Design a protein around this nucleic acid. Structure first.
Ligand code: MG
Ligand code: ZN
Ligand code: ZN
Ligand code: ZN
Lengths: 1187, 118, 128
DNA sequence: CCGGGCCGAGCCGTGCTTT
DNA sequence: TGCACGGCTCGGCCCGG
C-alpha cells in the first residue's frame, strides 16, 4: 500500500543521485557524446517508444491497453499507424515496416531484440512465375534464432495482418519452392543444429503451402543446396533465419499462436487450428499401481545420451531414486528443485548448489538448492550396518565407509511446475504435512476442538486438546508450529493412532510396498521362531524395544531388512534393531499376534491394513529420474582474446595486441581509425579534446574517391556527399598513428606509469570506428578489469530464486536492515533478531562472494576515473565487499536490449545469483540453468556509448539501450504467473492426487500469482511451504571441475553409478557412454582420409599437399588438420569400458575392429619397429579372437 | 621403525632421479641386508633393478622387513631440496608416514604420505 | 607523493638470523604450502608450513649456527603469505644478518643494513 | 659467471557415427 | 557449444663448462 511506494521512491532517489554525477561528468566533452546514452523508462509503453518509436505513441499505447487489453491494443495501434496520423513517412514499404516493428514491440512487452535485430527488411514482391500478383516478404537475420517461439510466431502473425490490411495477394509458391525448403530443413538439421524439433515433411508442406507471406532472408551458413537457381531468390545457400521462424515459430507453437489469433479475432488460420486439433478381488494399492502404470508411463527422453564425466543419478521412475514431494521452499519454486545437502555429499560432490540436472517428470532441466527439512539417503556401510543420513555432519563423517546407497533422498517440486508443463498429478507419498492435516481434522471431528497448523492458536483450545489427549501443552504447541522438525516419540504416535484413528506417523513407516508378501511371510516366520525381543508398556500399549537374531538363523532375509529401510547393526554375529526402530517393524505386524500370509492380487500394505488395527499409508509410491549437466558458474566476462581498451592496433602489437609493447619499440601502426580536427588551431588526431587549447574538436568526413577532408560543419552543408564527386563520404579512413606519443600523453594525463601490459583490438567492428580514450584503458589495466563490446564491465552467474531470507544467512546486521527499510518479519512481528525470516522486496538482490570480489575492483576503477580523468569527488569509497550494500546494479539477459535496476543487500558463499522470481522474469529468464550479467550502474552510465556497438546485425543485442526503474508483475513474463503462494497445500489436493487428475482441474484450490494480478497485493504477501536452516549449506564446487583426464572422469562416473542401487551401471551406462566415444572415433577416422592441408604461416588450405613439400607463395611448412593423435585419444577408455563391463557383443566387436582399422591404416608409414619385453597387457581383442 | 643415515644426499637424489625417469611408482623393499627395488615402465620396454646393501650406509637399523611405496615425483623434489654435503636421514614410526630429514647447516624435516602399489 | 609512516610497535619477540636459512625455509614452504607460520619460544625459533596433506618443520636454537640471538617477551606466533615473503627474501646474501621482529597477529618487520649505515625495512601484514 | 635447453603460458588452427 | 589434439613464440629458470 504505502511501504511499496516508499520503496520505489527510494529507488528513484538513488537512481537520480547517480544520474546527476553521470550527467555532470559527460558534459566536459571527453566522450563521444555530451550526454548519457541510456534513457530510463517506467512501463512497456516507454520501452516501446524508445526502442522502435515513433514519437508520441506512448500515450496511445497506454490508453488502448487500459481500454481493451494487449492484443487488441496492438492491432488498433497497427491500424492507427497505417492510417497515418503520426506524420507522413513515405512509401508503402516504410509504413508496413514501421507498423510491424511497433506492433511486435508492443506484443512482446518491448524487452527482446526481435523487433530491432530479427527483422532485417520487409519488401513487396510479385508472383512473377504464375500470376505476377503482389505479396509481402519478411527478411530475417541471424539474431532471430534467439528471440523465441512466441516472438517468431507473433512476428509471422503481425506480418500476415499487415499484408492483409495492405490489400496484397496471398503468396503462391511453386513445387520446386517446396522441395528446396524441405531440402534446406534437412540440410540444416544434418549440418548445423538439431533444432530441438523436427516437423514431418507433410506438416512443413502444409505450412509452406498455407503460409500467406514470404519467409525469407539472407544466407547464414556455408552450405549450398542442390535445387539451385529457384526463381525469386537471390542466394543458393542455407537461409537459417528464414527456416527457424517457420519450424520453431508457427509450427512448434501452434496452440499458443491459435489462442492468440482467437483473442485478436482475426480469421484465415483455421487450417492451423484444425492441425492442432488433429495433433490432440483386488487390493487398493495393487489397483492403484496398475492404474498409475497405465496412465503415467515412464519417460526416457532425458537419458537418451550420457556424456563422459556427467553421471546419471537414477533410472526412469525406478524405486530407490528421487522421492517426489509437493512443496516450495524459501529459495526454490520457479523451475528449481529442493535437495538435501547430505545427498550432495554422498554422491562424491558431483552435485553443488546451482548445478543443473536434466529431469524427467515435470519439465526438462532444473537447478538444485539445499533444503534441510526433507530426508536424505539411506546407506549401507562396509560392515553391513544400515544408517539414515538425514544430517550434513553425519554425511561428512560416514562418507568413507559407504558401500551402497539404498535410497537417494527426496526432491521438493512445486505445484506450479506441474501447471506450467501440463503434467498429470502423480500420487503423493505420505509425509508430515499430510499427517498433520489428518490429525487436526480427526481431533475436531471427535472432540470438537478447532486448531490450525503452521500458525498460532488460542490458548484455550490448546489446553482442551492437551487435557483430552493427556500430553504437555507446550509439546502440542511446538508440534503444531513446526510439524516438519518436531515429531512425537514412537509410543506417542501409536497412542495417537489408537485414540483418534489415523495412520501411523510417516516417520516410523518403513517401505513395506518395496518387498513382496512372500518375503514378509518368511521374515515373520524367522522372527516368530528364532528371535529374542524385549517389550515395554505405555498407557496400556505394548511395543518392542530390541530385537536380537543370529546372522546364520536370519539367512538371506537380511536383504528384506535392507530394502525396508530399517536401521540395524551387526555385532558378534548378531543383528540388532534398536528402540525407535523395533516398534517401527513389529507394531504393523501386530506384535506377532496374527500370522502374515501372502495373497494373490494383494500388496503388503493391503494385507497389513486388512488384518491390523493401526493403519498405514504408502510412504513411497512416486519416484523421479534425473541426470547431471552444465555445472554452475560465477565467472567474469572477457573477449576471446582479453581486451582492456577499445583502441585499434593492428599487427604492431603482436599476437596479444599489446599497445604498450608497440609503443616502446617506436613502431608505426597503420589502421582504420577516425580523426578529429580542432576548429581553432588545426590539430588533427584520434582525440575529442585538443591538447594545446583544450576545446572540443569536430569529426572529419573523407571522400573515398578523392580523399578530400571535410569538417562536420562543412559536410552537413554538402549533405555528406562530395562536391567533386557524387559519392557518400565516410567518417573514417585508413591512417598512420605513432603509439609512443599517444601513450606518453595519456600516461602524463592520468599519472599512471607502472602499467606493464595494455591490450587492444586488431580492428574496430563499428561503422564509425571511433576509438576509446587511452586513459580509461590505463586505469582499467591498473585496477585489473576488462571491457566489453559496448564499453562496460560485466559479471556472469547462474540465477536462482528467493522470496524470504534470514539476516544471519547473508551476514547483514539487523540495524543495517532497519536502515535499508526492513522493519517487520513475514508474520508481522517487529524485526529484532537475526534468526527471523524477512520477506524480500522485488528489486533487492543477493550477490555471491566472487561477484563482490570483482565489483570491488570495478568500484575502485570508477573512483579512480572520477578523481583523475574527470576531476570530481569519489562515489563508492569502499575497502571491503560489504561497503557496496545499498548500491545499484543493472541486470541484463544475453538476448534482450533492456535492463532492470537492482539493489545489493548481502552476500552468500555459493556460485549463483539469488533474486526474487519477479526480477528473473523481468529479464525473460526461466531459472532452470540460465546465466545473466550484472554491472554497476555508474560504470555503465559513464562508459556505455552507442558509437562502439558492432554494425554487423546483432551489435544491439545484449546492450542496455533502456533501463526499467520500476517492476510490474503484470508485464514481466507468463511462466511466473503459475507460481503458488500458499503456506501449505490443502487436504483436497492430497486426496485428489490419488485420482490421477490434471492440475487444471484444481487450479482454483491452490492460490497462484495469477489470482492476485491487478490488486495491490502482488508485491506484498507471498508464502512458502518448506523452511530451510541455511540457504548456502553444502558443497560449493562441482567435482566435475577438478578432474583432468577423460579416463579419470569416466572412472569416477562409473563408480558413482555402481554405488547407487537404482541406476544399473552394468551395461546401460557403459553402452550409452560408448555411443558418445564411438561416434568420435569413427568420425575422426573417416575424416582423416579426406582432410585438407593448411599452411602454418598464412591460412590458405589446399585439397592435397604440394609435391614440392613446402607452401608455394609462402615461406612456411604444410601441416595436418586431423592429426594421428586426434583419432585415437578415446581408444583407451573405450577399451576399458568394453573389457570391464557387460556390453553386447556387437559393441565389443565394433571396438575390436576399430583398433585393428586404426593399426592397419598406418602400416606403411609407421611400421611396428620396436619389440617389447613382455606381452598380454590384459587385452580383450586378442582373447576374443583366440576364443 | 627404522633409522637410516646416508652421507651426501646429492648422490642419493641423483640415483633416485635416474631411476624415476622411466617409471612413476615403485615399492622399496627394505630388509636386514639393504634396500632393493624393481619395476617395469608402462610401455613394457624397460626393467630397472636397484639394490643398496647395508655396507654403504653409514648407519643402518632395521627390524624384520617391509615394503614402502611412495610417488616418485614428490620424493624426487624433496631429495632435490638437499645439498651436496648434507647427511640424509630416512626415519619412520608406527604411523604410516615417511619422514625425511636433512641435517646440514640446519635441520629440516618433510612429511611424505605413503601409497600402496600392486 | 603519498605520506605514510607507522609508529614503533610493541614487538614481543625479536630474532636475528642469516639470509640463507630464511631463503631455504621460504622455498620449502612454497614447495609444500601457500602460507608460513612464525613460532618462537624461549631460546628456540621454528617456522612451519602445513600443506593440504604434507608438512614442513624447520626449528633452530641459539646454540645453532643459524641464529645469532633471541629474546622472547612471551609466547608468540603468526602467519604470513608466501608470495610476498618469497619476493622480499629473494636476492639475500649468504653472509648477511637479518633482524626480524613480530608478535601476535600483527605485522612482521624485517630489516638489514647496507654498508653498516644504510638500511632497508619491510612491513609485512598478517593473515586473517 | 654468461649461455643454451627445457618448460609452461598464451595466440592462431582442426575435428566430433552416415548404406 | 564445451572438450581433445597439434604448429608456433616467448620469457624465467636453472644447470654445467
Ligand atoms: Mg531456461
Ligand atoms: Zn586546438
Ligand atoms: Zn570526392
Ligand atoms: Zn603459405
Amino acid at each position: 500500500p504505502k511501504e511499496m511506494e516508499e520503496y520505489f521512491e527510494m529507488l528513484q532517489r538513488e537512481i537520480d543521485k547517480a544520474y546527476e554525477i553521470a550527467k555532470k561528468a559527460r558534459a566536459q566533452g571527453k566522450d563521444p557524446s555530451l550526454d548519457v546514452e541510456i534513457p530510463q523508462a517506467t512501463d512497456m509503453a516507454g520501452r516501446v517508444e524508445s526502442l522502435v518509436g515513433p514519437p508520441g505513441v506512448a500515450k496511445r499505447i497506454r490508453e488502448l491497453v487500459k481500454e481493451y487489453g494487449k492484443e487488441i491494443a496492438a492491432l488498433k495501434i497497427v491500424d492507427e499507424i497505417i492510417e497515418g496520423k503520426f506524420g507522413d513517412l513515405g512509401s508503402r514499404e516504410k509504413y508496413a515496416e514501421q507498423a510491424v516493428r511497433t506492433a511486435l514491440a508492443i506484443l512482446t512487452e518491448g524487452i527482446v531484440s526481435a523487433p530491432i535485430e530479427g527483422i532485417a527488411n520487409v519488401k513487396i514482391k510479385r508472383n512473377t512465375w504464375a500470376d505476377n500478383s503482389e505479396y509481402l516478404a519478411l527478411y530475417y537475420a541471424g539474431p532471430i534464432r534467439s528471440s523465441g517461439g512466441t516472438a517468431q510466431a507473433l512476428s509471422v502473425l503481425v506480418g500476415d495482418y499487415v499484408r492483409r490490411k495492405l490489400g496484397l495477394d496471398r503468396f503462391k509458391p511453386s513445387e520446386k519452392h517446396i522441395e528446396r525448403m524441405v531440402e534446406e530443413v534437412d540440410l540444416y538439421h544434418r549440418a548445423v543444429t538439431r533444432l530441438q524439433y523436427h516437423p514431418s515433411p507433410e506438416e512443413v508442406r502444409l505450412a509452406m503451402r498455407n503460409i500467406p507471406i514470404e519467409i525469407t532472408g539472407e544466407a547464414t551458413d556455408d552450405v549450398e543446396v542442390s535445387h539451385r537457381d529457384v526463381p525469386g531468390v537471390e542466394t543458393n545457400q542455407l537461409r537459417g533465419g528464414a527456416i527457424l521462424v517457420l519450424a520453431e515459430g508457427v509450427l512448434q507453437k501452434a496452440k499458443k499462436l491459435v489462442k492468440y489469433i482467437d483473442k485478436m479475432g482475426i480469421e484465415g488460420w483455421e487450417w492451423l487450428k484444425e492441425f492442432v486439433e488433429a495433433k490432440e478381488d483386488m487390493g487398493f494399492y495393487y489397483s492403484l499401481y496398475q492404474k498409475f502404470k497405465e496412465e503415467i508411463a515412464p519417460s526416457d527422453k532425458y537419458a537418451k545420451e550420457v556424456i563422459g564425466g556427467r553421471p546419471l543419478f537414477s533410472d526412469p521412475s525406478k524405486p530407490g531414486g528421487f522421492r517426489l514431494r509437493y512443496g516450495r521452499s524459501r529459495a526454490s519454486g520457479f523451475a528449481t528443485w529442493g535437495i538435501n545437502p547430505a545427498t550432495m555429499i554422498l554422491v562424491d560432490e558431483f552435485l553443488a548448489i546451482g548445478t543443473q540436472l536434466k529431469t524427467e517428470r515435470p519439465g526438462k532441466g532444473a537447478v538444485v538448492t539445499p533444503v534441510t527439512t526433507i530426508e536424505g539417503p539411506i546407506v549401507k556401510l562396509k560392515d553391513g550396518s544400515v544408517l539414515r543420513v538425514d544430517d550434513y555432519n553425519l554425511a561428512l563423517k560416514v562418507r568413507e565407509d559407504v558401500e551402497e546407497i539404498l535410497y537417494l533422498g527426496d526432491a521438493v517440486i512445486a505445484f506450479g511446475d506441474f501447471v506450467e508443463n501440463n503434467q498429470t498429478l502423480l500420487p503423493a507419498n505420505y509425509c508430515e504435512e499430510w499427517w498433520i492435516l489428518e490429525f487436526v481434522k480427526a481431533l475436531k471431528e471427535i472432540y470438537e476442538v478447532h486448531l490450525e497448523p503452521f500458525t498460532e492458536n488460542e490458548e484455550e483450545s490448546i489446553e482442551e486438546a492437551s487435557d483430552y489427549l493427556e500430553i504437555d501443552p507446550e509439546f502440542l504447541k511446538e508440534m503444531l508450529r513446526d510439524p516438519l522438525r518436531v515429531k512425537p516419540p514412537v509410543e506417542l504416535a501409536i497412542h495417537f493412532s489408537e485414540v483418534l484413528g489415523i495412520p501411523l506417523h510417516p516417520y516410523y513407516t518403513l517401505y513395506w510396498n518395496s518387498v513382496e508378501p512372500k518375503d514378509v511371510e518368511k521374515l515373520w516366520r524367522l522372527l516368530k521362531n528364532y528371535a529374542e525381543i524385549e517389550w515395554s508398556n505405555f498407557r496400556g500399549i505394548k511395543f518392542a524395544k530390541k530385537i536380537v537374531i543370529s546372522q546364520e538363523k536370519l539367512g538371506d532375509s537380511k536383504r528384506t531388512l535392507e530394502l525396508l529401510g530399517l536401521p540395524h547393526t551387526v555385532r558378534d554375529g548378531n543383528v540388532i534393531v534398536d528402540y525407535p526402530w523395533a516398534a517401527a517393524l513389529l507394531t504393523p505386524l501386530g506384535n506377532l499376534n496374527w500370522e502374515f500370509m501372502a495373497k494373490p492380487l494383494y500388496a503388503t500394505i493391503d494385507i497389513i491394513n486388512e488384518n491390523n488395527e493401526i493403519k498405514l499409508r504408502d510412504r513411497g509410491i512416486s519416484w523421479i529420474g534425473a541426470r547431471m549437466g552444465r555445472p554452475e558458474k560465477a565467472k567474469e566476462r572477457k573477449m576471446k582474446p582479453p581486451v582492456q581498451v577499445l583502441f585499434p592496433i593492428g599487427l604492431a602489437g603482436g599476437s596479444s595486441r599489446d599497445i604498450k609493447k608497440a609503443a616502446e619499440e617506436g613502431k608505426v601502426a597503420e589502421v582504420e581509425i577516425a580523426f578529429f580536427k580542432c576548429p581553432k588551431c588545426g590539430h588533427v588526431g584520434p582525440e575529442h579534446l585538443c591538447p594545446n587549447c583544450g576545446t572540443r574538436k569536430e569529426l572529419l568526413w573523407v571522400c573515398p574517391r578523392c580523399n578530400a577532408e571535410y569538417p562536420e560543419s562543412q559536410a552537413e552543408g554538402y549533405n555528406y556527399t562530395c562536391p567533386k564527386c557524387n559519392v557518400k563520404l565516410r567518417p573514417y579512413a585508413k591512417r598512420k598513428i605513432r603509439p609512443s606519443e599517444l601513450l606518453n600523453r595519456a600516461m602524463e594525463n592520468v599519472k599512471v606509469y607502472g602499467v606493464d601490459k595494455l591490450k587492444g583490438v586488431m580492428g574496430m567492428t563499428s561503422g564509425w570506428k571511433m576509438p576509446e580514450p587511452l586513459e580509461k584503458g590505463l586505469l582499467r589495466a591498473k585496477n585489473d578489469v576488462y571491457v566489453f563490446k559496448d564499453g562496460t564491465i560485466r559479471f556472469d552467474a547462474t540465477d536462482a530464486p528467493i522470496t524470504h531470507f534470514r539476516p544471519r544467512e547473508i551476514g547483514v546486521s539487523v540495524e543495517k536492515l532497519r536502515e535499508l527499510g526492513y522493519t517487520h518479519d513475514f508474520e508481522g512481528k517487529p524485526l529484532v533478531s537475526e534468526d527471523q525470516i524477512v520477506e524480500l522486496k522485488p528489486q533487492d538482490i543477493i550477490l555471491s562472494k566472487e561477484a563482490g570480489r570483482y565489483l570491488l575492483k570495478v568500484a575502485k576503477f570508477v573512483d579512480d576515473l572520477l578523481e583523475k580523468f574527470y576531476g570530481l569527488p569519489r562515489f563508492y569509497n569502499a575497502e571491503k565487499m560489504e561497503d557496496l550494500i545499498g548500491h545499484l546494479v543493472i541486470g541484463l539477459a544475453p538476448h534482450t536490449s533492456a535492463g532492470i535496476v537492482g539493489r545489493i543487500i548481502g552476500f552468500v558463499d555459493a556460485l549463483v545469483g539469488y533474486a526474487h522470481p519477479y526480477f528473473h522474469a523481468a529479464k525473460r529468464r526461466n531459472c532452470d540453468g540460465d546465466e545473466d550479467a550484472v554491472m554497476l550502474l555508474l560504470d555503465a552510465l559513464l562508459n556505455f556509448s552507442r558509437y562502439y556497438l558492432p554494425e554487423k546485425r546483432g551489435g544491439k543485442m545484449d546492450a542496455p539501450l533502456v533501463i526499467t526503474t520500476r517492476l510490474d508483475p503484470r508485464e514481466v513474463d507468463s511462466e511466473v504467473h503459475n507460481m503458488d503462494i500458499v503456506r501449505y497445500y490443502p487436504l483436497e489436493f492430497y486426496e485428489a492426487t490419488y485420482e490421477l487428475k490434471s492440475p487444471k482441474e484444481l487450479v482454483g484450490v491452490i492460490e497462484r500469482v495469477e489470482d492476485r494480478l491487478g490488486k495491490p497485493e502482488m508485491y506484498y504477501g507471498l508464502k512458502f511451504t518448506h523452511d530451510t536452516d541455511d540457504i548456502a549449506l553444502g558443497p560449493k564446487m562441482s567435482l566435475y571441475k577438478q578432474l583432468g583426464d577423460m579416463e579419470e572422469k569416466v572412472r569416477r562416473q562409473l563408480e558413482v553409478a555402481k554405488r547407487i542401487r537404482a541406476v544399473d551401471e552394468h551395461g546401460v551406462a557403459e553402452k550409452i557412454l560408448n555411443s558418445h566415444l564411438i561416434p568420435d572415433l569413427r568420425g575422426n577416422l573417416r575424416s582423416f582420409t579426406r582432410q585438407e592441408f593448411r599452411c602454418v604461416k598464412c591460412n590458405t588450405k589446399f585439397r592435397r599437399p604440394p609435391l614440392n613439400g613446402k607452401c608455394p607463395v609462402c615461406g612456411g611448412k604444410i601441416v595436418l588438420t586431423v592429426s594421428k593423435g586426434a583419432i585415437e585419444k578415446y581408444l583407451g577408455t573405450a577399451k576399458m569400458l568394453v573389457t570391464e563391463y557387460n556390453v553386447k557383443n556387437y559393441t565389443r566387436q565394433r571396438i575390436c575392429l576399430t583398433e585393428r582399422d586404426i593399426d592397419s591404416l598406418f602400416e606403411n608409414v609407421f611400421p611396428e619397429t620396436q619389440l617389447t619385453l613382455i606381452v598380454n597387457p590384459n587385452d580383450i581383442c586378442q582373447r576374443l579372437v583366440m576364443a | 621403525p627404522f633409522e637410516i643415515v646416508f652421507e651426501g644426499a646429492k648422490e642419493f637424489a641423483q640415483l633416485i632421479e635416474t631411476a624415476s625417469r622411466l617409471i612413476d611408482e615403485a615399492a622399496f623393499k627394505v630388509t636386514e641386508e639393504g634396500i632393493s627395488m624393481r619395476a617395469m615402465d608402462p610401455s613394457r620396454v624397460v626393467l630397472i633393478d636397484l639394490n643398496l646393501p647395508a655396507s654403504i650406509f653409514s648407519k643402518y637399523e632395521v627390524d624384520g622387513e617391509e615394503t614402502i611405496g611412495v610417488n616418485m615425483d614428490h620424493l624426487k623434489k624433496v631429495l632435490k631440496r638437499g645439498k651436496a654435503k648434507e647427511t640424509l636421514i630416512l626415519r619412520k614410526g608406527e604411523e604410516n608416514f615417511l619422514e625425511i630429514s636433512l641435517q646440514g647447516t640446519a635441520t629440516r624435516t618433510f612429511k611424505l604420505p605413503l601409497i600402496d602399489v600392486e | 607523493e603519498i605520506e605514510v609512516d607507522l609508529p614503533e610497535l610493541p614487538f614481543t619477540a625479536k630474532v636475528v638470523i642469516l639470509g640463507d636459512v630464511i631463503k631455504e625455509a621460504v622455498k620449502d614452504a612454497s614447495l609444500v604450502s601457500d602460507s608460513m607460520k612464525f613460532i618462537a619460544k624461549e631460546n628456540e625459533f621454528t617456522m612451519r608450513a602445513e600443506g593440504e596433506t604434507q608438512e614442513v618443520e624447520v626449528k633452530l636454537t641459539l646454540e645453532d649456527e643459524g641464529l645469532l640471538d633471541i629474546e622472547v617477551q612471551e609466547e608468540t606466533k603468526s602467519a604470513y603469505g608466501i608470495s610476498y615473503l618469497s619476493d622480499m627474501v629473494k636476492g639475500l646474501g649468504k653472509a648477511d644478518e637479518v633482524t626480524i621482529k613480530f608478535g601476535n597477529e600483527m605485522p612482521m618487520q624485517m630489516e638489514y643494513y647496507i654498508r653498516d649505515e644504510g638500511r632497508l625495512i619491510f612491513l609485512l601484514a598478517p593473515r586473517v
